[PDB]
Structure 1
Amino acid sequence: QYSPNTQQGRTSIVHLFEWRWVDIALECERYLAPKGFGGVQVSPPNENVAIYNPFRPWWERYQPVSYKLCTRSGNEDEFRNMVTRCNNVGVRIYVDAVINHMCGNAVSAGTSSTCGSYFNPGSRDFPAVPYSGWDFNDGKCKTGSGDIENYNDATQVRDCRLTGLLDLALEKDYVRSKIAEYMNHLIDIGVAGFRLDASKHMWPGDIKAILDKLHNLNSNWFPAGSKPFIYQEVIDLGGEPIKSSDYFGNGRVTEFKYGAKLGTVIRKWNGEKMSYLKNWGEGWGFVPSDRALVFVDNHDNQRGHGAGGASILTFWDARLYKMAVGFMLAHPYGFTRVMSSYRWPRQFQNGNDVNDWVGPPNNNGVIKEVTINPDTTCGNDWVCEHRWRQIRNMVIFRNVVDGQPFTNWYDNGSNQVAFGRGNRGFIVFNNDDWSFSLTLQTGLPAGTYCDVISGDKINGNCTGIKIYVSDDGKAHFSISNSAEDPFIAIHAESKL
């Protein structure tokens, strides 16, 4: 459960949020494989409710109608084509599994679904699965509203409806089997693992029972006995009865404290400073590294829809965002997930974005293809953060230093810090309101290294900043607080 199942040397996965299967397949071959990306988290591939009010919101995909591989991202044929092509290039696919619930209980009955399947939330009828009233927790939930009302009561959080979403009776073998049937279908197709959506709303024991029915990965691409990578979406910040540790027996868990705290630190909120990141990781109360799935932002909290709050950094905060992602990718703690999003008309009113529901770039509801600009950036309103030189090069940095220890830490007692990874890499950050000019011990072999943030190493030459490491491993670093990117990163493969 705990191993990502990525190719040796590939240490990160990217969330291609709302991307079409055909576009992902191409991205795997043209960019992800050549650039060393480990895998891709795809949006829910199962049929969901088609919501027109608002117009096709991104969250409609988290309201299942059936387990048919039929969505705005493509059909089963397109999905299989993508998994196959990506796997053939050594890039894994991880499915966002929405198994805790079906659609909202108040959703109108009919065929307003991505595959035309009929469903009736009111009567608990989902014939395409099939599911009936006997498969939901209507009788198990003890709240007066039938929905989750108090998170201080661990029982209702699992047996009641999350904001009205019909809650599946996961204790029933029939329900467990139907979900396993869906997941096994995906595994046999070639997926390497899953993100278990709303895991906090599922009993650890129920998840385990379901995972116990899962197949080993497809033996045509993976070694015998390979188990699907499992990372459970559990939002666990401050004081709550439910702890993400309650799910360690099933696989990894999303560490939402990671992005929340990193955001507050880089934003320098309430006295926080980068010098405090010296003991980053378990020292900050985070889950063990081998059970952590980390990220700066996710599809939910990048639009104030999830845990983290206003401290979460996103592509909207480009400069600080690159620094946060850079620190994450350089630091050894956990398995890293990079976010890839689309632009939307953010409309802030009284502190809240009233357009936080807007779905992916589209034409009359049809998701737009991802176009690639001559400079390798994306068009059609796709942000493609994973294609940003500063982020892509850090994804590679993590690969190059894989296994190397956290060492040679330095800090000015404020927001100027630096550290290395064994003798394979070194990174320096300046988040202070003044320039940083100092000679530091890099632990790297003597030579000339290309800074992979400001530039690239191309045919024996650096396109950006150049760093010179002496025989004693020391090197001079100069970063103005006015620099486009106030951080420098160099590694074994950026050496001339």
Structure 2
Amino acid sequence: QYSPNTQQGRTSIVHLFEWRWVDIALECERYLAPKGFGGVQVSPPNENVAIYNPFRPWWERYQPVSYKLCTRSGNEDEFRNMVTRCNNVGVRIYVDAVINHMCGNAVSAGTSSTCGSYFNPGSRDFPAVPYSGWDFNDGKCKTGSGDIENYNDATQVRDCRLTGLLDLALEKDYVRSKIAEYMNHLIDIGVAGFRLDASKHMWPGDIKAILDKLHNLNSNWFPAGSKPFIYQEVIDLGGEPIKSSDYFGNGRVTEFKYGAKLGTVIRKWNGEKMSYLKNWGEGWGFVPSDRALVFVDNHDNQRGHGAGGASILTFWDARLYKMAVGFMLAHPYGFTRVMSSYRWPRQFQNGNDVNDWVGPPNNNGVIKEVTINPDTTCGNDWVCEHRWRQIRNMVIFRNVVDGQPFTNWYDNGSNQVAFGRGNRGFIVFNNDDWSFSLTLQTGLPAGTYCDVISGDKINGNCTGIKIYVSDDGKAHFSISNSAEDPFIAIHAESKL
């Protein structure tokens, strides 16, 4: 459960948040595969509640109605088409599995679902699965409201409703079997793994029982005995009785402390400085690297919805965001996930975004297609951070330096640091309010290297900054605190 199952040499997955299956299929072939991306995390592919008030919010997708592969992203045929085309190009698909609950208990009964399925929350009836009152934890939860009221009580966190969402009785073999039936349908289709949504709200033992019911990956694309990659979303910033280490026996876990701390350091909040990143990793109290799924921001905290708070960096903070993603992709700790979002009209009031519910770009509720501009950026309000030169080139950087050790660290005791990955790559950062001009040991073989942040290596020439490494591995770096991107990265494959 701990191996990504990506093609050898591809080290990152990208979250194409709210994308349509047809657009992802095209993206696998025209961009992801050629640029070395390992895989894609897709939004929940199962039928969800169609919410009109507010108008089709992104979060309606986390309120399951059935396990039919029928959503605003497409139907089952389009989904299977996407998985097949992506796999044939070496790009894996990871499914966001919402298995802890069904929709909100206060949702009106009827057929306001993305596939017309009938459901009645009030009487606990979901005939399309089917589930009945016997399949929920209503009689097991002990809070007066029936919802989770206190995260200091590890029991109610698991047996009660997360903000009203009907909680499935995951201890019952019947329920475990319906969930496995759903996941095995996907595995046999060709998915390589899953993001287990709201894992903190499920007992580690119940999750394991479900995982034991899973098939090995489809033998038409994966070697015999391959097990699906599992990463569990468990928000553990300390201070709570539930620890992410309790879930190590099932697979990897999301390390939310990662983005939170990187954000405060790069923003230079309360005395924090980049020189402190010298021992970044377990040294900061993070989970073991081989159990970590890291990221700068996720679909939740980029809109102030999960954990991370005000320190989280997003595409809105473009300049600092590229630097944070750059550091993440160059550093050896964990398995990296790149975020890819859409723009929404943020409207802050008393420090809060009242439009944090806004769903993906659409026309009368129909999600807009991802259009590609002549300069390779996206239109129709899709941000496509994974297509930004600075981010795309660092995804390649991680591939090139994969396996290389963290070495040749340098820092000015403030916010100017640098380090290399074996003799395959080197990166320099300047986050101080003054210029950086120094000769450093890179550990790289002599030659002329193209800086992959400012430009590209276009066969024989660099479109941006060029770095010259001498015979002893030394090279001069000059970065003004006024540079568009205050950092430089060079690697074995950007050499001339």
TM range (shorter): over 0.9
Residue by residue over 1:214-252, the C-alpha shift from the partner in whole angstroms, topping out at 9 and shown as x without a partner, is 000000000000000000000000211000000000000
SS in 1 for 2:47: coil
Shift of 1:460: 1.0
Shift of 1:178: 0.3
TM-score by length of 1: 1.00
Residue by residue over 1:77-133, the C-alpha shift from the partner in whole angstroms, topping out at 9 and shown as x without a partner, is 000000000000000000000000000000000000000000000000000000000
Shift of 1:355: 0.1
SS in 2 for 1:293: strand
Residue by residue over 1:306-327, the C-alpha shift from the partner in whole angstroms, topping out at 9 and shown as x without a partner, is 1100000000000000000000
SS in 1 for 2:111: coil
Supply the distance in 2 between the matched residues of 1:360 and 1:348 (Cα, whole angstroms).
Answer: 19
Supply the distance in 2 between the matched residues of 1:182 and 1:282 (Cα, whole angstroms).
Answer: 36
Supply the distance in 2 between the matched residues of 1:257 and 1:130 (Cα, whole angstroms).
Answer: 38
Supply the distance in 1 between the matched residues of 2:82 and 2:449 (Cα, whole angstroms).
Answer: 37
SS in 2 for 1:93: strand
SS in 2 for 1:86: helix
Residue by residue over 1:419-444, the C-alpha shift from the partner in whole angstroms, topping out at 9 and shown as x without a partner, is 00000000000010000100000000
Residue in structure 2 matched with residue 287 of structure 1 by the alignment? 287
Residue by residue over 1:375-415, the C-alpha shift from the partner in whole angstroms, topping out at 9 and shown as x without a partner, is 00000000000000000000000000000000000000000
TM-score by length of 2: 1.00
Supply the distance in 1 between the matched residues of 2:306 and 2:418 (Cα, whole angstroms).
Answer: 31
- 1:482 to 2:482 alignment: yes
Supply the distance in 2 between the matched residues of 1:70 and 1:122 (Cα, whole angstroms).
Answer: 23
Supply the distance in 2 between the matched residues of 1:55 and 1:435 (Cα, whole angstroms).
Answer: 48
Supply the distance in 1 between the matched residues of 2:421 and 2:459 (Cα, whole angstroms).
Answer: 25
Supply the distance in 2 between the matched residues of 1:426 and 1:133 (Cα, whole angstroms).
Answer: 58
Residue in structure 2 matched with residue 417 of structure 1 by the alignment? 417
Residue by residue over 1:322-344, the C-alpha shift from the partner in whole angstroms, topping out at 9 and shown as x without a partner, is 00000000000000000000000
Supply the distance in 1 between the matched residues of 2:441 and 2:306 (Cα, whole angstroms).
Answer: 40
Residue in structure 2 matched with residue 400 of structure 1 by the alignment? 400
Residue by residue over 1:65-86, the C-alpha shift from the partner in whole angstroms, topping out at 9 and shown as x without a partner, is 0000000000000000000000
Supply the distance in 1 between the matched residues of 2:409 and 2:100 (Cα, whole angstroms).
Answer: 43
Residue in structure 2 matched with residue 363 of structure 1 by the alignment? 363
Supply the distance in 2 between the matched residues of 1:216 and 1:441 (Cα, whole angstroms).
Answer: 46
Supply the distance in 1 between the matched residues of 2:387 and 2:226 (Cα, whole angstroms).
Answer: 30
Identity %: 100
Supply the distance in 2 between the matched residues of 1:278 and 1:195 (Cα, whole angstroms).
Answer: 30
SS in 2 for 1:103: strand
Residue by residue over 1:248-275, the C-alpha shift from the partner in whole angstroms, topping out at 9 and shown as x without a partner, is 0000000000000000000000100000
Supply the distance in 2 between the matched residues of 1:16 and 1:192 (Cα, whole angstroms).
Answer: 16
- 1:163 to 2:189 alignment: no
What is the total number of aligned residue pairs between the two structures?
496
SS in 2 for 1:485: coil
Shift of 1:374: 0.2
Supply the distance in 1 between the matched residues of 2:200 and 2:2 (Cα, whole angstroms).
Answer: 18
Structure 2: which 5+ runs fail to align?
none
1:20-419 residue pairs with structure 2 within 5 A?
20-419=20-419
Supply the distance in 2 between the matched residues of 1:174 and 1:190 (Cα, whole angstroms).
Answer: 25
SS in 1 for 2:222: coil
Runs of 4 or more consecutive aligned structure 1 residues displaced over 3 Å after TM superposition: none
SS in 2 for 1:307: coil
Supply the distance in 2 between the matched residues of 1:440 and 1:242 (Cα, whole angstroms).
Answer: 44
